[PDB]
Amino acid sequence: IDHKADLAVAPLAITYVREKVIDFSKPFMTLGISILYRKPNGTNPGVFSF
């Protein structure tokens, strides 16, 4: 905004809220979001499960 810098090549999704006051190039790559979670142990003692 303040022009103290120039074109800033950095990870930044082309979002409308930014786009309203920011000029943006064409996407060099796409982007998505998703669940990221550990692999569940899913283990029951079983020796005294009953």
Partner: protein, 51 residues
């Protein structure tokens, strides 16, 4: 997947660079150079051990 967002390059108001960096961006893409640059940096090779 949830949303299809797009990774672009920031640039200030009316800067002449957008209109001519995109042609570079497209040029880098269409020739495949992006894929290799994609490949060369996401070549993390730890495999998913089968479950």
């Amino acid at each position: 997947l949830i949303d299809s967002k797009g990774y672009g390059v920031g640039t200030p108001m009316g800067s002449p660079y957008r209109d001519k960096i995109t042609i570079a961006i497209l040029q880098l893409q269409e020739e495949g150079k992006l894929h290799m640059m994609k490949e060369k940096w996401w070549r993390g090779n730890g495999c998913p051990e089968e479950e």
